Amino acid sequence: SRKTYTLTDYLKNTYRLKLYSLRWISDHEYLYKQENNILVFNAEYGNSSVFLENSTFDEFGHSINDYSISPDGQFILLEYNYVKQWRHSYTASYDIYDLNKRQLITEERIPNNTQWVTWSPVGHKLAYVWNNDIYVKIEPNLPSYRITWTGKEDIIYNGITDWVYEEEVFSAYSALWWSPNGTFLAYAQFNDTEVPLIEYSFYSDESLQYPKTVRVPYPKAGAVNPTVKFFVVNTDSLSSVTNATSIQITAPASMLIGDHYLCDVTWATQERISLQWLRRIQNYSVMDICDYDESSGRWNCLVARQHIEMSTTGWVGRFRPSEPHFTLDGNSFYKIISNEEGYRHICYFQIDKKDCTFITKGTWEVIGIEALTSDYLYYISNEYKGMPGGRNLYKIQLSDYTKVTCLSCELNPERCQYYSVSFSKEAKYYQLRCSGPGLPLYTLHSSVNDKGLRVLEDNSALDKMLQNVQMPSKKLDFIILNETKFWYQMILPPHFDKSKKYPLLLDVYAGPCSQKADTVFRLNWATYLASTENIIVASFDGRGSGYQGDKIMHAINRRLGTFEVEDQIEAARQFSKMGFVDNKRIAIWGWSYGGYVTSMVLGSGSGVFKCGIAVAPVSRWEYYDSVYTERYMGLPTPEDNLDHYRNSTVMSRAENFKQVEYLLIHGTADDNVHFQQSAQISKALVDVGVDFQAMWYTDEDHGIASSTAHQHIYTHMSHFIKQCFS
Amino acid sequence: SRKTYTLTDYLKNTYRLKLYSLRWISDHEYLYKQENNILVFNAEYGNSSVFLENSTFDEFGHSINDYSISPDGQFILLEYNYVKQWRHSYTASYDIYDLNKRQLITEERIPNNTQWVTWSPVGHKLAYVWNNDIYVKIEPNLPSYRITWTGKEDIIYNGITDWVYEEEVFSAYSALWWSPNGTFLAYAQFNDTEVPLIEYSFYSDESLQYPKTVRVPYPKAGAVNPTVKFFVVNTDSLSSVTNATSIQITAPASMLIGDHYLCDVTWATQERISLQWLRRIQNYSVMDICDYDESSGRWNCLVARQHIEMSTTGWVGRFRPSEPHFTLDGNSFYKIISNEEGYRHICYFQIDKKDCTFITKGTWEVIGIEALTSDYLYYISNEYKGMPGGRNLYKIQLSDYTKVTCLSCELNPERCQYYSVSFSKEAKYYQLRCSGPGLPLYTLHSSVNDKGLRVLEDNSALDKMLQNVQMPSKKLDFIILNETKFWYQMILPPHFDKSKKYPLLLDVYAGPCSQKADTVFRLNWATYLASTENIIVASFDGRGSGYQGDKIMHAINRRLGTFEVEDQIEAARQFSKMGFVDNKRIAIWGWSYGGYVTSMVLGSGSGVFKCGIAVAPVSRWEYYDSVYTERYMGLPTPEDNLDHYRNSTVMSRAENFKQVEYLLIHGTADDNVHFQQSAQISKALVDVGVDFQAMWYTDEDHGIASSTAHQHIYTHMSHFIKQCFS
Numbered sequence A, B: 001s002r003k004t005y006t007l008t009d010y011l012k013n014t015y016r017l018k019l020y021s022l023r024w025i026s027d028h029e030y031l032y033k034q035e036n037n038i039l040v041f042n043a044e045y046g047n048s049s050v051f052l053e054n055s056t057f058d059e060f061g062h063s064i065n066d067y068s069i070s071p072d073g074q075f076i077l078l079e080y081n082y083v084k085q086w087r088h089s090y091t092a093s094y095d096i097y098d099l100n101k102r103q104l105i106t107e108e109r110i111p112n113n114t115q116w117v118t119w120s121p122v123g124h125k126l127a128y129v130w131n132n133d134i135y136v137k138i139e140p141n142l143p144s145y146r147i148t149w150t151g152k153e154d155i156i157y158n159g160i161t162d163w164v165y166e167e168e169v170f171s172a173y174s175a176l177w178w179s180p181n182g183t184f185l186a187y188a189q190f191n192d193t194e195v196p197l198i199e200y201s202f203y204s205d206e207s208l209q210y211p212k213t214v215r216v217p218y219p220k221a222g223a224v225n226p227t228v229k230f231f232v233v234n235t236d237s238l239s240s241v242t243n244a245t246s247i248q249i250t251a252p253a254s255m256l257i258g259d260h261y262l263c264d265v266t267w268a269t270q271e272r273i274s275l276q277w278l279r280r281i282q283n284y285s286v287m288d289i290c291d292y293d294e295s296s297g298r299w300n301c302l303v304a305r306q307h308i309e310m311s312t313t314g315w316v317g318r319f320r321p322s323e324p325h326f327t328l329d330g331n332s333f334y335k336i337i338s339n340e341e342g343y344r345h346i347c348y349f350q351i352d353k354k355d356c357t358f359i360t361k362g363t364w365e366v367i368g369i370e371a372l373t374s375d376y377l378y379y380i381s382n383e384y385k386g387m388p389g390g391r392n393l394y395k396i397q398l399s400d401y402t403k404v405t406c407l408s409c410e411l412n413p414e415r416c417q418y419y420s421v422s423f424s425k426e427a428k429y430y431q432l433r434c435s436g437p438g439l440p441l442y443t444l445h446s447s448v449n450d451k452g453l454r455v456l457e458d459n460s461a462l463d464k465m466l467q468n469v470q471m472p473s474k475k476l477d478f479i480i481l482n483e484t485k486f487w488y489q490m491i492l493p494p495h496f497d498k499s500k501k502y503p504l505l506l507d508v509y510a511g512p513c514s515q516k517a518d519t520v521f522r523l524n525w526a527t528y529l530a531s532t533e534n535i536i537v538a539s540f541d542g543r544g545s546g547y548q549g550d551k552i553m554h555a556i557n558r559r560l561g562t563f564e565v566e567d568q569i570e571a572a573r574q575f576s577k578m579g580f581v582d583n584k585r586i587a588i589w590g591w592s593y594g595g596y597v598t599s600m601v602l603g604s605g606s607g608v609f610k611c612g613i614a615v616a617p618v619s620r621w622e623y624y625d626s627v628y629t630e631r632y633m634g635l636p637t638p639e640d641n642l643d644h645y646r647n648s649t650v651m652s653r654a655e656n657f658k659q660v661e662y663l664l665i666h667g668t669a670d671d672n673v674h675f676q677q678s679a680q681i682s683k684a685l686v687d688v689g690v691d692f693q694a695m696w697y698t699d700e701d702h703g704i705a706s707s708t709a710h711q712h713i714y715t716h717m718s719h720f721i722k723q724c725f726s
């Protein structure tokens, strides 16, 4: 009775999840769009009004992939001709539509192939990067001022990150920050002059006679890194005749002594900006708080407002030092730092006092700070029910740290255990986003007394569709290893029979600070495996895992490829003895870091796994970028950690692959985990006489996400799994 | 009962074939290298003495991979530090040993990384190429004379071929020709300045952090080709105070009108040299016969003494115009050319006569002229028994073309139907090499009466072993496709039972002028498949096939990817109806051209084949090198043959692969059939939603021949075939 969730339903996305993506434009209203017009809503009452009819651009001539309405409500940024680059970066074409006089601007238009564009936070000023240089437009129809003149392809980047900074530190292409009211425009400048280049072939369309060689500045472990500089320009002092002047903010001397990184920039006030720098050895970081000197024009950072954050058990921050959240006057601030007990909690700082006061504590962690009002601090943590894989919104009274109130825990405990929030301009209202374990539920609330205003989207449509299908269940529980408990999850086939022995696929990632066992609702490949192929899909979080304190997360410091792989094996070893797992049919697969662990596990010789699939795996740490690798492994030098670098490679384990069935998959145009990584694995397996399956995806990058390659890789992997299991 | 020829026997070469490679050093003696030392043999009696002891170079400090004794017998050339490049090219270090004073010459030594070395034809002069420049050594311990100063890596090649000339015209790295008595040294100069570069990654040892990019001047179909120049320097008049003066030999005028090639150079006398040129449209070739001008110091090629060789049905020559064989006075010569009936036979020329005279004829072809005396012309042909797949040595009396005698036909009819030959300096003696159908048999003979002096090697050892194993048999026969005979061969399993139904594997190459159906004895993968797996391994020579006249060979002229793949499909269709074939289990596989045909067949939609393996296949002709591709396809322009270039790609047939099981294999460092070709095949299959198997071999080239890769690919393919047929 009832059909199952098939591979085709997954590949064709036949069971869609409804979202409610809104954009706050004030403290009272937000914008909501369908696949047509953009409506404007009143949070208090719920009523709306068309902000601009979908028709407006019927004969534009181009497909619009995104809009961006200025804080003024006066103009609209039209983005089209989207050309994806790396994970976050991309170039596109832009046009501005004057909302007032309903007309398209055609004078002094934004150049084509613009790398990045952003409105000011309050009016309608524009800042865009083109050809690695920064430009500013005070008025959409007036000419723009060139702010920088050093841009140079693959060499100098102004206002935009280079490859490694986009991927490993800012998780963005953008490298510029407007001040609160738009008076100042801060930006970073990267110099990749001496950064080695990764080179790989790109075949392109069949018509291309000779393959093209792609080369990008990419620092691998221990290689030369790009240098960085920081500047702040005043957008009200620029004219047509004179060239704008950018004031640089240098140092700290404690940083200039060696290699370092700019890891965070956050404006505190109209005239105060805070910067956080990190040494190449990501053990020590410094925060400068700089103020504008009206009667001098430059920016000074008082060594007194400078705060040091370092670590003795590992690196600093989850991936980088957390960002600060300042009080309105900018004289104090809050930020998430590790406990003396190893747990990340919110600490309160006076900008000119070295010691901070923790306002939260306990054996759980604060995920992030979401808003700050004069009376409350709102944050998300996994405190509730002591489960690390849960997320809930809380508020804490700034006058009594003892008064903590959970705003989402009780709304619907059975259906919602994972929340994210979106506050209005002055935190007068907020939207709660529950994404599991049940179907996603979006609601609106008012901060005065946290009264729930209404439901924005309950995904009832999808719910009706799903009762017609045999959906799998999800079990989130834990096991204890050496006193310490570690969580895991199991996507169980429909009508799970604890009597029967099902085959088990271990879906793994296990990279530092990862979490694969949570309460999130997901419709993916694992859903298909359990629902149609009756396969149990598990995930486990062992040493190195995040959101559980540094004792667990820093357990693999300077030692990647050890405990996180071992625990992965110990997990399935315990899983097999649970009674309903066929210990003769246990597999393992993973992508990127998960490909590394999958490979390391298959070549461990544990004898626990029959087969496994590795997609875009790392094979030896010297092949991966510096910022990420060195953060956990240090430098690959004899004086530092070279021995472990050479001891944690997949090829050193080639001989052990004789006992398993392996599938190695990799995209030839992977700019992240280079094909090189899989090429060396395959070569080691060949030199030892180990047979295995392989598949390359020409011109696909790290996500192997083209519509056809995506369908093909999961189809290929499905056949392999079924074959290993039947 | 009994064991079979297993995959392991093939990969580990358990049953070794014995050879007998001798090197004629005169008209009466030859050198025969034992695994340890080199022996000198007297052909008359068969008596031998040690030319040089195996221990002579114990404390040499280097592993010697080859020798080379000057025609003088005075010096030995020791080759070491051998580093392979393309199919024929390589570099190495050399040392000269004085046989008389038994002492290693340590002064004015030949440079390391030498690209080519060769003694003169009569004494002990030396010519070598280093850094693309030529050098001459009149005496082994004297300073070299630099002949050329224009050499430059990847641009100008003096005395050595560039990538395409090496692979497609001369089948050698060498581009220099000593005159008969060593007085003159002729050489070619290649200019690759504007030739595009193929670029691909080479991963190297695990320790290489960044993959290196290899780039080599490689002209793909229709691209800019290298230019060539020919020079001749007198090695008897070189000073040491003045730079060597090289005299250039240009034209023909009929070749200078556009792109052309130097396709052959053969000396006629001490002062007459012959040169053959080919137009880029390999339809027309011209032979120049140039004479040295004693009292002018130059070379004159009298347009009147030149002979034109062209074709209206196709291209000239099997792969290129054949080489001429001049008579004593250099006034006349014999050379194989296509009949008026389209069969290649020997034609007798006069250096200044317009029409030649055929000395042989019939519906069969002369494979090659092996030796020419003032008395007889010795040649190899497939006339005997009217079997194009057979080879025998014949001699035709120059005084009476009626007196042609077969010298090998009757030696051993049952065991020997395929001969190659090696004559002594003046053709006084000759070694016959029988390579099938029976075990290879090496014999020695004297030309005077054609007496069989003695057996050199009869593989009696391998025969004692094979008698204890269930070896397969070979069936060589033909089928008749509308008025014409087309041969094929079948490797049949032991105890072949015409009533049972065996699965059949079609081994295919099918490129122009190829021949896969012959009487040659082989111990290969097919041997294993038939013997152990009981699989019939067939091969078929259809339209385009060679050694059967132009009507058959030129049938695919300007039409690659048509008739040769169709006929491949017909053969399989006809084999499945012979009564001993399981039409449910028919497969096909091929390498390089064979991979292209295999792919085209599997994408034809005929449904005849269940599965197929394509190794290093061509996927579209615009990706392959010009000299080869254009010879059969013409130019890829609208005015020439662009349309068919586009009609014959593998990717355009991707949709038809849904009905087959395909295994695509390619070495990532293939400098001949670039990985690119397979990369486009896989991309087309993915974009069409077709599942298939793939395997890349990192850092392997076109041969995928390293010890480990060779054993791995064949083990991988066996599994694929077993699975497909079981």
Ligand SMILES: *[C@@H](N)[C@@H]1CCCN1C(=O)[C@@H]1CC[C@H](COc2cc(C(=O)O)ccc2Cl)N1
Pocket (backbone or CB within 6 Å): B087, B167, B168, B171, B511, B591, B592, B593, B594, B618, B624, B628, B672, B673
């Ligand atoms: C694969 N066979 C590709 C397909 C197009 C032609 N091709 C080549 O590799 C061409 C064919 C002519 C030239 C030399 O080919 C060979 C040379 C030798 C040798 O021992 O010198 C052996 C086998 C071949 Cl195919 N490259």
